[PDB]
Design a protein around this ligand. Structure first.
Ligand code: ERC
Ligand code: CLR
Length: 442
């Protein structure tokens, strides 16, 4: 329609605003707050910068090319605007590829979740990406190599009102493979091993870390006695001074009240051995425990850490079916109890662990695993927004004039919106959520 162009213009203007305002907040939160100045966040700034240049130099000039159906900026800016457009995509895919490699080397490292690259060394990697991007995008466009031999393409380059990206079969293969396909193959494969290592990390300590909760300070439990770390009872005495004398005796140093993650893991290993021996000494728990595998053994220990050996022995109907290796039948009995009524979220994970015999119930539940899931969506969003364009671009090489001009522009425009997608996905992390609130005054 006639007035439809005006209506679509307001929609496209809000997209430009969503990309700029969104990415500005990401770059500002990292630079202003010292809290978010990590090695990975330095690449996030580089990723947000590449998305910012899109919404300032590519997206506003790109939207105007549809509103008037022609170019009103000149042949000089037409070549420059196209050069930035490819540069921003080339840098983004390479930065996301670097993050995938960086996260793999941090997860496999003995000092887990800590990047091997230093602040000064990471800044070089950012510059290495932009220089390689400039050599692969700016050079083939400015120093003409993309120009097609056919007359239909020549008419567009000659015209001052035409800025359609007509490319030869040699460049169309090179620009798709080097600036998109090759970094995508590495990004998908390497980050798949990152999720594989997250599944490898799943242990008895990590299971109770989500269920009970690791607490470095001395706290009074549900009963009233002094507890520390993961369900480790210090003393039954109501005096706090008695707990401090036991805490120093259990570790071997002056604690004063606060301990560490590694020392809490050491105390848990002392408690887990006492729990297993407590089950073996028990007349009812011992025959059931012998008929449980390594993963399912941990689900029974999880119950003992919550209520105790006498409490778990009370589940007469549940234990009889667990010993017989009937998982689906015992799951109903375990759900029909006081344990499920008091702690529903905890029981749901434990019962599902008994059902399958896998740690799949504790997927993306840890503080570290949620951060890996967040970065995984950034890689997933860029793929699902750019791949439908790049997969269609190869069809033009196979069959000439098959895909419509409206189809080519729309699929290219899906990747334009992707620049403003990332800041909204960054809101998932609680560290960034506090940074955006204090900056915008909420
Ligand atoms: S102003 C002309 C009418 C509107 O249509 C457009 C024409 C041209 C563009 C910019 C071209 N898009 C580049 C594309 O995103 C891209 C990126 C990266 C790589 O490696 C590419 N390789 C290719 O072979 C082809 C395209 C590539 C935008 C328009 O829409 C506003
Ligand atoms: C403009 C074209 C040519 C490329 C621009 C690349 C720019 C945006 C890249 C390259 C170097 C990068 C910077 C490297 C160092 C830092 C300091 C750090 O504490 C926050 C991120 C920050 C600030 C990066 C921001 C993004 C950055 C400035």
């Amino acid at each position: 329609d006639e007035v439809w162009v005006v209506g679509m213009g307001i929609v496209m203007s809000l997209i430009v605003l969503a990309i700029v305002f969104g990415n500005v907040l990401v770059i500002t939160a990292i630079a202003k707050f010292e809290r978010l100045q990590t090695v990975t966040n330095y690449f996030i700034t580089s990723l947000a910068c590449a998305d910012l240049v899109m919404g300032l130099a590519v997206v506003p000039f790109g939207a105007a090319c549809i509103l008037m159906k022609m170019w009103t900026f000149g042949n000089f800016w037409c070549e420059f605007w196209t050069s930035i457009d490819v540069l921003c995509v080339t840098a983004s895919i390479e930065t996301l590829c670097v993050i995938a490699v960086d996260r793999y080397f941090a997860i496999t490292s003995p000092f887990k979740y800590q990047s091997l690259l230093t602040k000064n060394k990471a800044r070089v990697i950012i510059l290495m990406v932009w220089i390689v991007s400039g050599l692969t995008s700016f050079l083939p466009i400015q120093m003409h190599w993309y120009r097609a031999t056919h007359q239909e393409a020549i008419n567009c380059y000659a015209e001052e009102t035409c800025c359609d990206f007509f490319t030869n079969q040699a460049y169309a293969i090179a620009s798709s493979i080097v600036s998109f396909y090759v970094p995508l193959v590495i990004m998908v494969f390497v980050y798949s091993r990152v999720f594989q290592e997250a599944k490898r990390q799943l242990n008895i300590f990590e299971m109770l870390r989500i269920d009970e909760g690791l607490r470095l300070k001395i706290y009074k439990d549900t009963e009233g006695y002094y507890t520390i770390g993961i369900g480790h009872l210090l003393t039954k005495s109501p005096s706090l001074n008695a707990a401090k004398s036991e805490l120093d005796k259990a570790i071997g140093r002056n604690t004063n009240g606060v301990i560490t993650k590694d020392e809490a893991e050491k105390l848990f290993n002392q408690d887990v051995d006492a729990a297993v021996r407590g089950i073996l000494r028990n007349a009812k728990l011992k025959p059931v425990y012998d008929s449980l595998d390594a993963v399912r053994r941990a689900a029974l220990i999880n119950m003992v850490f919550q209520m105790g050996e006498t409490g778990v022995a009370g589940f007469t109907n549940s234990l009889r079916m667990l010993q017989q290796k009937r998982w689906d039948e015992a799951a109903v009995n375990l759900a029909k109890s006081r344990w499920y009524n008091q702690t529903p979220n905890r029981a749901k994970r434990v019962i599902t662990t008994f059902r399958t015999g896998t740690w799949d119930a504790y997927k993306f539940c840890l503080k570290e695993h949620k951060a890996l899931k967040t970065l995984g969506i950034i890689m997933g969003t860029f793929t699902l927004c750019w791949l439908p364009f790049f997969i269609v671009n190869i069809v033009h090489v196979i069959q000439d004039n098959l895909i419509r001009k409206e189809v080519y522009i729309l699929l290219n425009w899906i990747g334009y919106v992707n620049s403003g997608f990332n800041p909204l996905i960054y809101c998932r992390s609680p560290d960034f959520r506090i940074a955006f609130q204090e900056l915008l005054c909420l």
